[PDB]
Ligand binder design. Structure first.
Ligand SMILES: *[C@H](O)[C@H](C[C@@H]1CCNC1=O)NC(=O)[C@H](CC(=C)C)NC(=O)[C@@H](NC(=O)OCc1ccccc1)C(C)C
Ligand SMILES: *[C@H](O)[C@H](C[C@@H]1CCNC1=O)NC(=O)[C@H](CC(=C)C)NC(=O)[C@@H](NC(=O)OCc1ccccc1)C(C)C
Lengths: 306, 306
């Protein structure tokens, strides 16, 4: 037993990370087959950030401007193209460590692992969620751009995020691997606003089931509620609406623990209205919302990968 | 910015993980050079757990009893020996993915990354700390034994933990890689007791500095304290004593933020005596103690590895 915020093993992604340097900007790229993917703002100097024209900057670049570097070995760039907010650098060598992969776009409320990199070298791995406002609460310092987020499903890496920028509240914004931003953000350093966030209700319920599976039961009761009456409380506490689909998705956890979904909703209502009264749940004094129902099932049945 | 519980990239360890099956027990092993390391209780059936004699069981075993399996490839065991609570299986093939490594034993209060594995396949990676009572609060299901904990320092993997068992409070116990248990635990399934734990004071202070670096300042004050007066409060709240060595170790973080260590102690005193009053620090409503001063510096300066 136990419950931890657990990332996927990162080896498959480590073998794809390279360093991309152009001008005086250095950042990370993702090397799959004979293409290196990276944030297009690499073609920008410090005076460029404030109002850039990326098509302008890119026609003025040439292949030899891009210094791509895989560990020690130099990668010769033989072509370049822009796709939305990502740059695709064609190199003359296919990455022999290329995993089975897919480019997927995730939904707010879903989780993924981030491999934080600097100068093409991995620094650390952690888990997070795409927030309802399309930001992520990451840990990124300057030079981390081009680090990616991903999920793994047996042997296949589903890349879902590439890091581009930090917003004023210290949260982070980026694109899918087709270069399309998550949320209403642009890769310019003009004033931009994260937007009001909400708590991911279905994930909080999943985590309450994780707690019951692990022996925390003090928040349980036999009050029950209707879905409509629960959603009235959700709205008041800035939680998102729970749908019948969410209830269905929680079915297996409900079946495992013998606690009906609407009964767990009544527990969450009381926790919202009363607080935790100095107690903890899975070592937290807050209601945690960055574990999906899949994350709970995965961790409490021991699914593996390779 | 941001602050996450961040593990080391796990690729170097993934390439060492194998499956060890003997009798009807299956667990994980660590394949370095031509040796596979695994918990010696693999030589035990279910009736053996309750009072085993491992020297008895091991002389009755032979090499062909041990089924070692690296992904798909079969590893021929050519010798076996016991070292404390670990088994060393000599195989006829050296692991070509063997990293630079060391076997280190860590101190309570130190952190490491765990690569949780089942059937020799990595499932997830997470960070934790060795508790003052020599347990770890892990996430381990049945079949996870032989999973290892580690730190990485540039290219060198320092293995510090191998998983053996779960105690009744849902915490975990294991050995260093020389097979010596952390704490007063034995690999028998007789009743065993975790022992009263304490909070790792120096780590809490490190995390408060992480918070200031990241813009949480509401808990700061200009009350100050002496080391002796702080330790009187520590003892009352079941915190461990802060030493002058701990103060010295916090020096760089103190210098970076301009907050004297003893001033941060006065903040922690007020947090202990008053609570957090509905506020959070780095997204937690509890005082977090599983980040070392090194973990904070590493994450807030961006140190990498390969
Ligand atoms: C790429 O390595 C970095 C990563 C960034 C540095 C610190 N933490 C991070 O995640 N990305 C950038 O430097 C980008 C460049 C870009 C194309 C926008 N710039 C930023 O992240 C700045 N953010 C920003 O300009 O957001 C909009 C804004 C909001 C308020 C005032 C002005 C601009 C950030 C470094 C200030
Ligand atoms: C190896 O894969 C497992 C991992 C274990 C299973 C569930 N979570 C885990 O971490 N380890 C074991 O099965 C060991 C075997 C051993 C050599 C002791 N057994 C346990 O972990 C049991 N723990 C135990 O017996 O602790 C002492 C104790 C305490 C109270 C009453 C009886 C015994 C556990 C599965 C019950």
């Amino acid at each position: 037993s136990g419950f931890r915020k657990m990332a996927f093993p990162s080896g498959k992604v480590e073998g794809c990370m390279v360093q991309v340097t152009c001008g005086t900007t250095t950042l990370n790229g993702l090397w799959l087959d004979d293409v290196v993917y990276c944030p297009r703002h690499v073609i920008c100097t410090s005076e460029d950030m404030l109002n850039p024209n990326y098509e302008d900057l890119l026609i003025r670049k040439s292949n030899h401007n891009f210094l791509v570097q895989a560990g020690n070995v130099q990668l010769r760039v033989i072509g370049h193209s822009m796709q939305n907010c990502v740059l695709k650098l064609k190199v003359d060598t296919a990455n022999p460590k290329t995993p089975k992969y897919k480019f997927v776009r995730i939904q707010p409320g879903q989780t993924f692992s981030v491999l934080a990199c600097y100068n093409g070298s991995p620094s650390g791995v952690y888990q997070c969620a795409m927030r309802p406002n399309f930001t992520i609460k990451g840990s990124f310092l300057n030079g981390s751009c081009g680090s990616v987020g991903f999920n793994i499903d047996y042997d296949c890496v589903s890349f879902c995020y590439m890091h581009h920028m930090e917003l004023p509240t210290g949260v982070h914004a980026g694109t899918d691997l087709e270069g399309n931003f998550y949320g209403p953000f642009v890769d310019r350093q003009t004033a931009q606003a994260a937007g009001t966030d909400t708590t991911i209700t279905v994930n909080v319920l999943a985590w309450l089931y994780a707690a019951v599976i692990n022996g925390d039961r003090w928040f349980l009761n036999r009050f029950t509620t209707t879905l409509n009456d629960f959603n009235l409380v959700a709205m008041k506490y800035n939680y998102e609406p729970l749908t019948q689909d969410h209830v269905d998705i929680l079915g297996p956890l409900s079946a495992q623990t013998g606690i009906a979904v609407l009964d767990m909703c009544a527990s969450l209502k009381e926790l919202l209205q009363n607080g935790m009264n100095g107690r903890t749940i899975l070592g937290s004094a807050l209601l945690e919302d960055e574990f999906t129902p899949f994350d709970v099932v995965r961790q409490c049945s021991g699914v593996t990968f390779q």
